[model samples]
Target: QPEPDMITIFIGTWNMGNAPPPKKITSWFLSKGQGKTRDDSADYIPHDIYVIGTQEDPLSEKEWLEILKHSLQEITSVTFKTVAIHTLWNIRIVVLAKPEHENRISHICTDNVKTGIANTLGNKGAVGVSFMFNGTSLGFVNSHLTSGSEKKLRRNQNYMNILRFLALGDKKLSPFNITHRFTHLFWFGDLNYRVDLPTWEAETIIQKIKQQQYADLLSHDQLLTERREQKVFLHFEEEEITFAPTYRFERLTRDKYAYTKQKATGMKYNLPSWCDRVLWKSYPLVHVVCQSYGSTSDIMTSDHSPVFATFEAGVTSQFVSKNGPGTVDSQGQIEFLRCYATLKTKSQTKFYLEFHSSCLESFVKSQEGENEEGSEGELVVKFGETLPKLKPIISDPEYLLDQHILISIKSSDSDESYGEGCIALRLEATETQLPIYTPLTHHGELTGHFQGEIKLQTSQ
Candidate 1:
């Protein structure tokens, strides 16, 4: 089953070379680069967050940490960030997951495929940590696909190879079927493939990846034409967001003040293309909302602006059923306590309610409803509710050995449909444990991992 709460994923191709950002702005939660000084407003709250980027800096851990911290001084809302790298072979892929998911987060696996590349490409590819959630697993392959060098082709090929291997476990085999195995999958980086002057090789490269069920998080699925009419570096948007380039790259005029400004205009300046991108799987669990910003002050903090998406896993049974009394012992009752359907049924039913109670509570008290619902609710609610949502059912019979009863406010016909802030709780078998999961904030704590009075709020 799926986890009801959303997992926010942001992918950016940061040009953290020798150059640093000029000024920073604050929003949602004030952060630098990706963050700035945020207003002390409730709207900035974030449920779960993940940030991924490609760093081209040649600094040590301490140096990079300083760079990261400075960059972080500009960010707010996030409780803390976990950092992981794919390779230290020059350039690398980095990922940061918010603090809340830290415990439930099993492990971060970094892929080191940057070494075996040809000289044509200055540096090899580095993919950030790859992780699995519920039944689906995902990896973000972040790299710079430049056209200046002959190596670009090899670099793209290597990473795509890595992508196919990770998805299908076989580089040569088609990732189509294997790709389906992962309920969710995505690829993001500076794919230097120019749309206007796109070549067959680049076209083939894009086709190889797009042929799979996966959809480009930044572009529309039913593309009107082979080439995007306009240039768009950061492409995830609704029908009318317009295609505009995020970077002027070689075209930018380096101002002495570093209060930098791009000299070029016309298609060169207005075309929308994204060197920085946020990609995701087509799974129902994912939802993205790309905020539009203005010019310099708009993107001053970084070369590329940030793109964010919220991810939620579908619902499914995560329970590993326990064996019941061994074969009814003695004469027709000849076994040790065997698992009877009745016991299983009762246990399942009880937990099912326990799961839904928490999930319903979450959905009820959600302020950021509708557009911000995060997508995994329907799937989880249907599949034992326990599987999809963050709340887990009480399965340990020992905890209920005495007499366990879950106390919850049953839904009335009038408010059958969930409304924001509609609060509820799950009483323990003894009506002791009160756990809740809200749709907006999705704040709730399970008895095991965390203890006493857990709370979560949403980004306004």
Candidate 2:
């Protein structure tokens, strides 16, 4: 039901269970029963965006990132790049988009919550990433809630905790809470909500999965019951569970469900249910049309199988009038530049700031004072020299990018105004009173007691 202008996206989630990733992800991305070759007519075309989530993955962030990049390269012709990635304990979520859509996607940020005992451990938690796509806000959460059928209420509470997790930024920053702020949100992971029926009854129902009787078994799913009772997961939309259970399978094998009479880790005769899932909710401005929803049984490295869904997510043509000078810029409504300067040394010293171009209209100095209070410093207007105005450009290596301002900072011993403190540069816009600020930590190496050179570097 998507319009011609809509964007197609592919989302997948799995619990790695501390296992290494597969050599290629093409098998999991394409539909089952299709021919092996990519050129086959039955093969699914590559999507513009891929949002992947994993829980219980013990690999480091770099390892997982390379694995995903290589996997995507093997599947599609489009050159995709990682937009954002976040990991908390075993839970990790990442966003990958085609190069053409890079500018439309900006303001990427992450937030996570620990729901373990006393909320101190990352064993049970969620990691989320939010970004803007064509001015439409979108948030994605990859969570691993509490396990065990008896911990139903605990699972629900964990969901609430994740919904309230705040991103890293000030109050005026991009969408603070995932559930409320984003125009659309996709939640997926090993939710761990088992079937509501007894072990014997659940096993009986699961046996009928081959005959396409999944609809009957789905009625007993704990998540569905909770949704109907209005106990949790309000407003979220989930597709019909038309596939078999995705959890408790023997490691390194397929089609074998783990059934043990009793014991954790050592299969007890526990019932197998569809634990891995994908759910999404969107505001009226945007429409999310689910094309396919199912789990792949081919991957056997973990106790849980991978679940994937194809979506045609459409955005409104009319731009929503934002209040202040938000993240986006004026030219083609591209995102405003977010630059940073990294000091050569960790120590605070004197440094200088320079503007690469004259387009920088004005800048303000602001900082958190010694008492931890926020205050604005001085406003400096005047570029180094007059230069031709640059056209609106997208962020990348090709463009000259934003103007870099020069700031001269000396240690407290030399400059009484600087003190043993820090200062930040804020770009002021006349249209909107709000300004974008970047912090300046230590400036440069200290040659003398408080003498140093200024180095204006780009951090973004």
Please write out the lDDT profile of model 1 over residues 1-460, one tens digit for every residue.
3443345444444544434433442331232222222224623454344444544545555555445444444454344565565544545565565665554454355654443445544564545555554323455656555432223344345544444344322122121222222334555555544333233333333443334322242343212222244212112232221223334233223121111224522122212234444444332223433332112224333344433333343322122323212211111100001110011011111111111121121211211111111143221112111122232223333211211112111122232212111122222322233343322100111111101222221111
Best by TM-score: 2
Q: How many residue pairs clash in each candidate?
A: 72, 15
**Worst lDDT 10-window in candidate 1:** 333-342
Error of model 1, residue 13, in angstroms: 2.6
Candidate 2, residues 1-460, lDDT tens digits: the string is 2313577777788898899866665666664421111224635366778898999888898898787777777766556888988998789898998877776777788888889575446498888888767645678888898887777788888887777664532234221235445556888899998876777675576577556576667787899998888666766799777777887788888656775555565444547877888899764335578877877767778888888887888643213224212332233221222222332333443333322211222322322112111134222222222212222222221121222222332333343222111212222322222333323322111111111222222213
The lDDT of each candidate is: 0.33, 0.59
Clashes of 2: 15
- Candidate 1 positional error at 121, Å: 4.7
lDDT of 1: 0.33
TM-score of 1: 0.46
